[PDB]
Amino acid sequence: SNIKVMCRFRPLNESEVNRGDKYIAKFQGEDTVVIASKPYAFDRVFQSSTSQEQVYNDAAKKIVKDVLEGYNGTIFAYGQTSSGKTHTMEGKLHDPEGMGIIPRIVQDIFNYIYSMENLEFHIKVSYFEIYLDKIRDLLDVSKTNLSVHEPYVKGATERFVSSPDEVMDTIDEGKSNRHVAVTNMNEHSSRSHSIFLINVKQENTQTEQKLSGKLYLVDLAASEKVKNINKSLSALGNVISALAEGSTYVPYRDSKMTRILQDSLGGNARTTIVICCSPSSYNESETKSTLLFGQRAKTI
Numbered sequence: 001s002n003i004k005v006m007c008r009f010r011p012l013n014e015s016e017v018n019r020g021d022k023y024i025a026k027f028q029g030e031d032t033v034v035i036a037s038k039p040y041a042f043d044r045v046f047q048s049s050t051s052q053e054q055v056y057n058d059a060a061k062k063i064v065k066d067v068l069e070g071y072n073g074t075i076f077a078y079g080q081t082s083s084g085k086t087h088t089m090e091g092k093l094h095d096p097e098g099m100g101i102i103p104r105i106v107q108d109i110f111n112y113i114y115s116m117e118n119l120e121f122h123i124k125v126s127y128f129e130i131y132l133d134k135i136r137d138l139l140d141v142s143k144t145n146l147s148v149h150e151p152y153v154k155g156a157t158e159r160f161v162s163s164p165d166e167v168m169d170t171i172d173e174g175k176s177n178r179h180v181a182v183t184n185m186n187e188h189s190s191r192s193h194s195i196f197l198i199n200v201k202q203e204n205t206q207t208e209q210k211l212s213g214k215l216y217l218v219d220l221a222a223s224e225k226v227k228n229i230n231k232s233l234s235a236l237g238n239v240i241s242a243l244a245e246g247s248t249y250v251p252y253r254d255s256k257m258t259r260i261l262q263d264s265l266g267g268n269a270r271t272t273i274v275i276c277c278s279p280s281s282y283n284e285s286e287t288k289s290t291l292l293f294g295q296r297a298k299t300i
């Protein structure tokens with residue numbers, strides 16, 4: 001498979017420093033993190049002060065190209081509550097430097113569209129949420145328990161978009177709709193998955209050569225138990241382990257999430273998983289857990 005895992009350590013936060021937490025994360029080359037003297041090796045390791053643009057360039061840039069070249073793809077942020085998942089995928093949406101993966105992907109995609117000649121494009125976006133193994137449409141709050149059919153989500157809103165501005169507006173709209181019938185936003189968002197889909201259609205007007213690529217950009221529920229592992233996250237660990245083994249059968253049916261992502265995760269699809277970590281001594285075992293999860297994808 002074409003699954004890459006990259007590990008991102010964020011800085012110690014204010015509140016970790018108030019306790020006398022130490023920085024337990026040690027670094028060996030550009031692909032290795034060391035914790036309690038155990039090495040953990042990934043496709044890349046991002047140290048605490050890594051810029052938002054370096055994470056983009058290594059995690060995501062090539063997958064855009066592959067989408068524009070007609071492949072499907074997935075990028076995930078996985079990790080503990082407060083580990084940096086949302087900072088990685090979204091970050092400061094409108095800030096040229098604080099911008100996370102999604103808004104950069106949208107900038108690159110359009111830099112390619114606008115730079116073309118006989119090529120015609122249709123780009124459409126969907127944005128939904130998975131909570132308790134159920135799908136809610138984040139663009140239409142009247143659609144709360146959507147079903148997955150043979151791979152598409154029945155009834156999901158799809159919006160045609162002509163500029164990155166309309167994409168970002170669609171995300172901000174989504175982020176706001178997500179508060180509907182939710183009492184506690186952080187709590188809920190750390191307990192659910194948010195999934196953004198860019199579908200990029202191209203037709204060469206003079207050659208009738210058509211291409212389509214889907215890109216799912218997923219900010220996953222928090223990885224630490226709440227007393228089981230979140231259901232989509234166990235499905236996903238099992239899909240990854242099976243791809244890692246080169247199993248001919250992949251248990252996509254283990255969750256609605258891995259059923260939607262079936263044509264975009266494994267096989268011919270491209271996949272980066274950004275595992276996010278806190279460097280704090282306080283979180284040593286959850287971090288170990290996050291690394292362990294990251295390693296399921298190492299081929300055997």
Ligand SMILES: Nc1ncnc2c1ncn2[C@@H]1O[C@H](COP(=O)(O)OP(=O)(O)O)[C@@H](O)[C@H]1O
Pocket residue numbers: 009010011013048079080081082083084085086087088190276
């Ligand atoms: N690489 C980083 N650099 C600076 N601050 C960060 C970084 N990652 C996370 N933070 C901050 O720590 C807090 C938790 O990040 P967030 O992405 O909200 O965590 P999560 O989505 O994993 O629960 C946020 O306020 C975020 O701004």
Ligand SMILES: [Mg+2]
Pocket residue numbers: 085086087189190219
């Ligand atoms: Mg978050």
